């Protein structure tokens, strides 16, 4: 029943794409059919960063705790839906986020460091609050993102701090030797790098 209702609303929004985000706002207001909201933002994206990153980050990190719990339950339940396959919109948006990861990966650009920071914080929100367990490819591209070298700006300092905190928190996503040597060489580079005056090295030392 829920699948048929979501499909009907999806076709209705395909017929009137100008009002798709209005339907997504109705979804987050009435606080049911999260898959419909995710699917609508995905069909809408189909530059900034993306409506997807903004939407799910605001859902998982907004002031409204009811929305946070609701979307966390959605993520948890969707994770068990065959553990793969495009049947669930969860894997569709996971692939979209991974595609964004490829998009911003390269030395990291001056323009992409803030987008990388927002994406990294969103991934932190997912795997920390929503209980998402990343796949091997997701973990690999996350590690590829963390170990990038931003061009020594305050945004770069923030990005490096966030990546380091992700490694400290979700250290289970390394689970391999080549990624271990990648992260230790990244740590050694970070130690050697001290031109970040214009609060990262303090965190590392601490």
């Amino acid at each position: 029943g829920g699948r048929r209702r979501t499909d009907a609303l999806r076709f209705l929004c395909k017929m009137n794409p100008s009002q798709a985000l209005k339907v997504r706002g109705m979804v987050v207001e009435e606080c049911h059919l999260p898959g419909l909201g995710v699917a609508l933002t995905l069909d809408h994206t189909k530059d900034g960063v993306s409506d997807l990153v903004c939407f799910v980050s605001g859902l998982l990190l907004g002031t409204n705790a009811k929305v946070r719990t609701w979307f966390g339950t959605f993520i948890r339940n969707g994770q068990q839906r065959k553990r793969e396959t495009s049947s669930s919109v969860l894997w569709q948006m996971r692939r979209q986020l991974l595609l964004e990861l490829m998009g911003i990966l390269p030395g990291l650009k001056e323009e992409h460091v803030v987008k990388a920071s927002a994406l990294l914080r969103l991934y932190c929100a997912l795997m920390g609050i929503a209980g998402l367990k990343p796949t091997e490819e997701e973990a690999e591209q996350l590690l590829q993102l963390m170990t990038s070298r931003p061009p020594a700006t305050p945004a770069g300092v923030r990005f490096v701090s966030l990546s380091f905190c992700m490694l400290l928190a979700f250290s289970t996503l390394v689970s391999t030797p080549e990624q271990e040597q990648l992260m230790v060489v990244w740590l050694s580079w970070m130690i050697k790098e001290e031109a970040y005056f214009e609060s990262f090295g303090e965190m590392l030392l601490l």
Partner: protein, 146 residues
């Protein structure tokens, strides 16, 4: 068991009882159900006929002690409880019988609720993803039922 029974009369009126005595009794029962469980079964049977809700509190305390003692549950005590015959006339003369069943059901429902956690929810979301877990208690319960 005789020494414990004799000391119970003095311990009931005394207010010096602490959680250490309950923990020691639970550890002794888990490690050896030869003597202590035999009297404990009769004591629990008598407690189910009382008007005050005392079976639920005792069951909750026992479950908490067992959980804190790393699943200190005696498998051989179940055979003694099944072979124990409630042939006393005081137990048969208790008018309120459904109350014991209700108390047992409430105790069972509250004992399963001890596994509720947000980390258990994340492990349930990790099942078909990270690692299939959060089911050891159920398996142990199935083994006990067997």
């Amino acid at each position: 068991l005789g020494t414990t029974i004799k000391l119970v009369i003095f311990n009931e009126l005394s207010s010096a009882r602490n959680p250490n005595n309950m923990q020691v009794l639970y550890t002794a029962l888990q490690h050896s159900s030869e003597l202590a469980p035999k009297f404990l079964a009769m004591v629990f049977q008598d407690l189910l006929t009382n008007k005050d809700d005392y079976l639920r509190a005792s069951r909750a305390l026992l479950r908490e002690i067992i959980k804190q003692t790393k699943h200190e549950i005696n498998f051989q005590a179940f055979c003694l409880g099944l072979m124990q015959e409630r042939k006393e006339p005081q137990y048969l003369e208790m008018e309120f019988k459904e109350r014991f069943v209700v108390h047992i059901t409430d105790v069972l429902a509250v004992s399963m609720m001890l596994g509720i956690t947000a980390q258990v929810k994340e492990a349930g979301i990790a099942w078909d993803k990270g690692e299939k877990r959060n089911l050891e208690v159920l398996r142990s319960f199935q083994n006990q039922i067997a």
